[PDB]
Curated annotation (Swiss-Prot), chain A:
Positions annotated with a glycan in the UniProt record: N40
Name of this protein: Spike protein S1
Stated consequence of mutating A7D: In strain: Alpha/B.1.1.7
Functional description taken from the UniProt entry: Attaches the virion to the cell membrane by interacting with host receptor, initiating the infection. The major receptor is host ACE2. When S2/S2' has been cleaved, binding to the receptor triggers direct fusion at the cell membrane. When S2/S2' has not been cleaved, binding to the receptor results in internalization of the virus by endocytosis using host TFRC and GRM2 and leading to fusion of the virion membrane with the host endosomal membrane. Alternatively, may use NRP1/NRP2 and integrin as entry receptors.
Subunit structure: Binds to host ACE2. RBD also interacts with the N-linked glycan on 'Asn-90' of ACE2. Cleavage of S generates a polybasic C-terminal sequence on S1 that binds to host Neuropilin-1 (NRP1) and Neuropilin-2 (NRP2) receptors. Interacts with host integrin alpha-5/beta-1 (ITGA5:ITGB1) and with ACE2 in complex with integrin alpha-5/beta-1 (ITGA5:ITGB1). May interact via cytoplasmic c-terminus with M protein. May interact (via N-terminus) with host bilirubin and biliverdin, thereby preventing antibody binding to the SARS-CoV-2 spike NTD via an allosteric mechanism.
Superkingdom of origin organism: Viruses
Organism: Severe acute respiratory syndrome coronavirus 2 (2019-nCoV)
């Protein structure tokens, strides 16, 4: 009925109305890194 | 679960370009590429030093 992650989060499910098997992938995330020269030099930045 | 792995600064291809350059200097020039500009010397003579 469910599939499991190592932290005991859910990794997959069987749907209770259509018995198809669904993955759960977490909604896309990450670190935001702001590459900057000194604010003394410029207020322009780039984002990783 | 909030965990991530960041990549190293040098790729393994860059690190192998450094071990390449360290090999190439060591063979062609002896210790001299550590002291300054790489002074070539024949390897048979470097091993005699
Ligand atoms: C949901 O309803 C349909 C009929 O409308 C039925 O075929 C299906 O088996 C039902 N789901 C479950 C879990 O029984
Ligand atoms: C910072 O700005 C001052 C403005 O007088 C300038 O003299 C200095 O060279 C700047 N330094 C850098 C690292 O941008």
């Amino acid at each position: 009925q469910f599939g499991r992650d190592i932290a005991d989060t859910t990794d997959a499910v069987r749907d209770p109305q259509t018995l198809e098997i669904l993955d759960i992938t977490p909604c896309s995330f990450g670190g935001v890194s702001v590459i900057t020269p000194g604010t003394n030099t410029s207020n322009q930045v780039a984002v990783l | 679960n909030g965990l991530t792995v960041l990549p190293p600064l040098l790729t393994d291809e860059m690190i192998a370009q450094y071990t390449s350059a360290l090999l190439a200097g060591t063979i062609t020039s002896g210790w001299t590429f550590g002291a300054g500009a790489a002074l070539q010397i024949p390897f048979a003579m470097q091993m005699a030093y």
